[PDB]
Structure formats: C-alpha cells, structure tokens
Amino acid sequence: KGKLPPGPTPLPFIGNYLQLNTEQMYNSLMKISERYGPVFTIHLGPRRVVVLCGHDAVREALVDQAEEFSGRGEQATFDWVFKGYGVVFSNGERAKQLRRFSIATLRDFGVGKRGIEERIQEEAGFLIDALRGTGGANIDPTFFLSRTVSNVISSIVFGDRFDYKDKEFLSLLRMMLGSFQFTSTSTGQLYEMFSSVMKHLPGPQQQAFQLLQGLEDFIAKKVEHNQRTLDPNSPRDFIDSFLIRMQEEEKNPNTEFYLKNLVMTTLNLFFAGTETVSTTLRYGFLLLMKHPEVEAKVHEEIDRVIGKNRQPKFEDRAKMPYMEAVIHEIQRFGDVIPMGLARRVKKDTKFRDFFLPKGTEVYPMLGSVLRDPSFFSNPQDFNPQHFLNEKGQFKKSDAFVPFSIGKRNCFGEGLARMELFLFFTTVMQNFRLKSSQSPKDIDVSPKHVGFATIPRNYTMSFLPR
C-alpha cells in the first residue's frame, strides 16, 4: 500500500481528542487497537503518532529496524525545560555525543562495578537505619525510599550523598515526584496534545513547570560551584568530567559540550536515576503486602542463601531465582513507563507494508508488551511464576521490556537492576511488612496512568525480623 497505518479520522488541530480519554490514555489507545490492529496512527492534537501494540510490533520496529526507529520523539512537559538539550530528549549528533559520554562517565564513576556496588550497599544500610528509627510505627514509605535511591545517582553526579535531614534535598524530591505524577494525570496527557496553547495558559501545568525550573536552578547552582573549584586533573564527579570535556572542546565551534548540555544531561541523570526506581520500590512493597505468601517465599530464600548477619551483595542474585522472579514481576506488574518514551523515524521508513515518513512520532506501548497474552499466562495478575519454570528456576522473557529495547534504550538499566536487587533484598532481610489494611482490601490498581504508572498513596510499617 505504501500508506501510513490506518486509524480513526482526525479533526483539524484537535486531532483524535474526541476519540480518546486523557485520564486513561493507555486504555483509549488499546481499545482503538482492537479495531485497527496492533500498528495504527493516532492524532494527539496536532501530533501524528504511530502506536505499536504487543510484543512483535514493538520488537520488529525497535530492534529489527533499530536504526530506523531510533530517533527521539516528544514528551511536551519535559521538553518545556530541556528544549531539545541534554541526553534524553535530544536527537542525532547531539544525542549521540551525550549518550556516548554519559555511558563512559557513569562507568569511570563505578557503574557496573564494585565501586557503585559498595555505594549501593552503604546507602542500603542507611535505609535500614532510617526504617529502624521509625520504631515499627505506621509511615509513608515514599520519601524514605526516594531519599536512598537518589543518593546513589547523587553520588555520581554531585560527588557525594545528601544528608537525609537536608530540607533542600526533600524539596528536590518533591519536585521530581510532582512533575512525574503530573505527566500521568489527565491534564498532563491533555498537555501532550495542546501544549501550543497550554504552556501560555494558567493551570496545573504552570506548577509542573515551576518544579522543573526548580530542578534546573539547583543543577545550574551545583555546576557554578564545581567550576570555581575545578581541578582539571582530578574530577570529583560527572559534572567535573563534563566541565573538563568542555575545556578540551573550547576551540571546536560545533561542539555538543557546552554549558546547556551539561546542565540538562545532569538533570536527566539526577531525575531518571531517582524517580523510576523509587516508584518501582514503592509499588514493590505494596505488591508484597497484598501477597504475604510471596513475601514468605522471599524470606525463605534470603535466610537460606544469605542468612541474618551479612549484607546482600550483587552476586547473591545468581543463587536467588525466586527473588529474581519477584523483582521481574514487580517491574512487569508496575509497568512504570507504560507507553515508553516517544521515538521517531530517522528517515523514510517501510514497516509491515506501511509507509512512515521521516520525522514520524512513534509510541512503543511497553505496557502492552509486559501484558502480552502470548508471553504471560495471566497478564493481569501478580504472579512471580511468570518468571519461573516448573523446577523453580528463573525463566527470562522476550516480553520483559521495562527499560525498552533498541538504540535509545535505557542506559541506566544496570544501575537500576543492581539497586532494585540490593534495596529489595536488604529491606526484606531486615523487616517483615505490615499494612494498615487487610491484604484482602489492598488496592494495587494505579492511582494514575499516563506517561508513568503511579501507585496509590499508602502507609505501612517495618517490623523487625
């Protein structure tokens, strides 16, 4: 045919807005999928987007045609601050340069290595201490968990951890959580469509912008302090590395290594390295209270493989298939980034006898892969067995795509995996969880779904084992 994928008919400017619910974007698009197939075109206001549903559609595009689908599309709320600068929301040579440098700098600062392992273990101990200080009292885990995750990437980017009592530290975390939650609301989803008007209008979007601006002002501040203390022979952190790279590139008029990219790349890492893991942890713990028998089984393995005295280390995962299945199932159930992060085609693309013009936006529906009925027996349930064979051994899935796949996939994946393993395991080793509520009545359905999947507010207690 050589045509754009089929889809419902758009109206000028508003696009397919009347055919969609902004409170439930994922459900809206999946419903439209039922009629037009797993590869269809939608109009998010003025934005023309090809939607890829289910495993085969997403993998075929994003891996089998990796280079063709490896452009970055928009996220309107985040583009408000980044403006195409920094590593995440950027394109071509910019994205290429920053991605290469960031991957390399994270390694030099210990990621994938012993150095960051020791850093995560130290921070996990500070979490345990904090959770003991609650004295088994009913509490909101939110910022306890976010504090601990954040201090890991903070270590890499700013040179050291924040004090848990730093009021500015909690301030930044509130900005992150707030901006994130916004993008998952119906207004955040409306904004994805009508940002041309809405960025200039009053509303909840303006407050979202203010939190993002806060985060920007704080990085800009940390950079200035690093510049006026810089030893160009001994970098303390990501910032100093980037500042040093900037010096070496000072006579290259076409460099990507300028101040704005430094500020934005550093914001990307601080944000990405905090909020997704945090959210996964919070959702994980509530999932576990809803399924206390899963927790029982987690406990059996921890006590057997690790025992009571030593701290979990990363290699313990090799001997711990049940824990590996549990964390996999949390990432699968939680589905933190349900519609991925928008890609776009780099040049004129043929895909499944559709034609996709250059610059075409693409929604890889990661949530529809994580729930694909061809890969999971009961996609709607929480069930570690999804990731286990008959002998109780860990079973990988091609449908396991929470970090996405292809050329612009998550490069924090390894860090994220190390953190989820060590934080989950050290908490579970030290505490049993208690809900303020009866396991029968715990609501594990999402509070919001949009750009992210946000779980419902809850309190709990950590009782010593």
Binding-site sequence positions for heme: 410
Shortest Å, Cβ 183 to ligand N4E: 8
C-alpha dihedral over 370, 371, 377, 380, to 10 degrees?
120
In single-letter form, the type of residue at position 219 comes to: I
Instruction: Please choose which of ligand N4E, ligand HEM, none residue 415 contacts, taking the beta carbon within 5 to 8 angstroms, the exact cut-off set by kind.
Output: ligand HEM
Query: Cα separation of 14 and 211, whole Å?
Result: 28
DSSP letter at 163 equals P
Backbone breaks in the chain (C–N > 2.5 Å) follow which residues? Answer: none
Tokens of 383: 């069930």
Tokens of 315: 């290699």
Instruction: Please choose which of ligand HEM, ligand N4E, none residue 336 contacts, taking the beta carbon within 5 to 8 angstroms, the exact cut-off set by kind.
Output: ligand HEM
Shortest Å, Cβ 272 to ligand N4E: 4
341 forms part of the interface with ligand N4E (CB under 6 A): yes
366 forms part of the interface with ligand N4E (CB under 6 A): no
Helices 238-248/204-227 angle, 10° precision: 70
Query: Cα separation of 186 and 450, whole Å?
Result: 7
Cβ–Cβ under 8 Å, residues 193 and 309: no
Interface stretch with ligand HEM, choices 50-58, 369-377, 379-387, 411-419 (CB under 6 A):
411-419
Would you give the binding string for ligand HEM spanning residues 273-312, x where CB under 6 A is met? x--xx--x--------------------------------
Least Cα distance to 329 among 423, 402, 390 occurs for 402
Instruction: Please choose which of ligand HEM, ligand N4E, none residue 271 contacts, taking the beta carbon within 5 to 8 angstroms, the exact cut-off set by kind.
Output: ligand N4E
Site for ligand HEM (CB under 6 A): which residue of 181, 404, 429, 430? 404
Neighbours of 255 (CB within 10 A): 14
Closer residue to ligand N4E in complex, CB, 61/427: 61
Residue with tokens 């994220």: 416
Site for ligand HEM (CB under 6 A): which residue of 408, 425, 451, 453? 408
Tokens of 66: 């990796």
Would you give the binding string for ligand N4E spanning residues 275-304, x where CB under 6 A is met? -x----------------------------
- Binding-site residue numbers for substrate are 78, 268
In single-letter form, the type of residue at position 237 comes to: D
DSSP letter at 21 equals -
Report helix, strand or coil for 162: coil
Residue with tokens 């023309």: 48
427 forms part of the interface with ligand HEM (CB under 6 A): no
Interface stretch with ligand HEM, choices 8-16, 131-139, 233-241, 264-272 (CB under 6 A):
264-272
H or E segment at 448?
strand 446-449
Closer residue to ligand HEM in complex, CB, 198/325: 325
337 forms part of the interface with ligand N4E (CB under 6 A): yes
Shortest Å, Cβ 99 to ligand HEM: 5
Least Cα distance to 59 among 377, 344, 399 occurs for 399
Helices 413-430/259-290 angle, 10° precision: 40
Query: Cα separation of 242 and 396, whole Å?
Result: 37
Closer residue to ligand HEM in complex, CB, 120/306: 120
Site for ligand N4E (CB under 6 A): which residue of 78, 101, 333, 376? 78
Interface stretch with ligand HEM, choices 295-303, 305-313, 389-397, 407-415 (CB under 6 A):
407-415
By CB under 6 A, name the binding residues for ligand N4E. 78, 88, 267-268, 271-272, 276, 337, 341
By CB under 6 A, name the binding residues for ligand HEM. 72, 87-88, 95, 99, 153, 268-269, 272-273, 276-277, 280, 336-337, 340-341, 343, 402-404, 408-412, 415-416
